Every structure is written in C-alpha cells, then in structure tokens.
Amino acid sequence: SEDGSYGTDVTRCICGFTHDDGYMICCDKCSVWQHIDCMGIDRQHIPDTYLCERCQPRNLDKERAVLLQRRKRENMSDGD
C-alpha cells in the first residue's frame, strides 16, 4: 500500500548474487547484507560495524566481487 515499506535488513550485495556462502555481514549504516569476500574483507578478521563500498570513501573492487560470486554460481553446475 502507498504508505511505506517495513524491511530494514535487505540483501543488496554488489555481486548481484544472494546468500549461498554463509559468510555474510550486515552494513550497519544502510542495513544491506553483503558477502565478506566480496568487500575484500578477510574472514579471519571480521569487523563489528561493517560498511559497504557506497558507505566507504574508499572504492572497493566491486567488479572483482562480481567475478568471484558469478564464477561461483557458474562452477555450481555438476555433470559432464
């Protein structure tokens, strides 16, 4: 209805691919869920207050993040 929309936690990862890994983080500012490996963060060192590329003054390799999660789903095609 034309009033609003309730749904804070929204998975808008820059790779255009949703939760399959298990290794994700919520963006404290704009409330968007992204994959750790996508934002170039180490899964060994996970920050509390995550920011995504659009919240960070630094430009993260968004294209490279697409390449990783894309080739991931391309690789998920078993058979001969």
Which x/- pattern, by CB under 5 A, does the window 43-62 give for Zn ion? ---------x--x-------
Of the candidates 55, 50, 49, the one whose C-alpha atom is nearest the C-alpha of residue 36 is: 50
Rule CB under 5 A: say whether 25 interacts with Zn ion: no
What tokens were used for 16?
A: 């255009």
Out of 25, 27, 39, 60, name the contact with Zn ion by CB under 5 A. 27
Annotated binding site: 13, 15, 27, 30, 35, 38, 52, 55
Annotated binding site for Zn(2+): 13, 15, 27, 30, 35, 38, 52, 55
